[PDB]
Design a protein around this ligand. Structure first.
Ligand code: QB5
Length: 127
């Protein structure tokens, strides 16, 4: 069985910024979801070998996880908040696409997404 390489977390030629909105996405949004009791399945790329999901990367073509998002925020990979918000939404959408309604992993994603939406609602205005 085979995993793909992880999503990109380093690209020197990609333009980057350090902004109050991206600081908020690390200090509030990522840290709030990361410490949650249901974070663990989302803290690293899906290991389709370990988890015996041989069709995962046949169905999910834009994989994303909070481990990757944490690295992107900590290594100042993003230009804007919308890029980072898209990564979170990709992660949740992948979970709902691959899994069945009422699956434990879907209930876990839904709990994290509720907190995500609460925090994004209070995204501060750009300085
Ligand atoms: C991020 C994500 O979607 N992860 C997972 C997806 C599918 C399964 C999984 O095992 N699904 C059941 C087997 C299945 C269904 N369709 C194909 N294989 C387990 C997963 O993460 C580990 C886990 C296991 C149990 C509770 C919480 C997290």
């Amino acid at each position: 069985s085979m995993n793909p390489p992880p999503p990109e977390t380093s690209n020197p030629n990609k333009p980057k910024r350090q902004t109050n909105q991206l600081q908020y996405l690390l200090r509030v949004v990522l840290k709030t979801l990361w410490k949650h009791q249901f974070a663990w399945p989302f803290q690293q790329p899906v290991d389709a070998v370990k988890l015996n999901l041989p069709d995962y990367y046949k169905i999910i073509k834009t994989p994303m996880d909070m481990g990757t998002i944490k690295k992107r925020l900590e290594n100042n990979y993003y230009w804007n908040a919308q890029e980072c918000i898209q990564d979170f939404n990709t992660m949740f959408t992948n979970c709902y696409i691959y899994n069945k309604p009422g699956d434990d992993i879907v209930l876990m994603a839904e709990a994290l997404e509720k907190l995500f939406l609460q925090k994004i609602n209070e995204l501060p205005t750009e300085e």
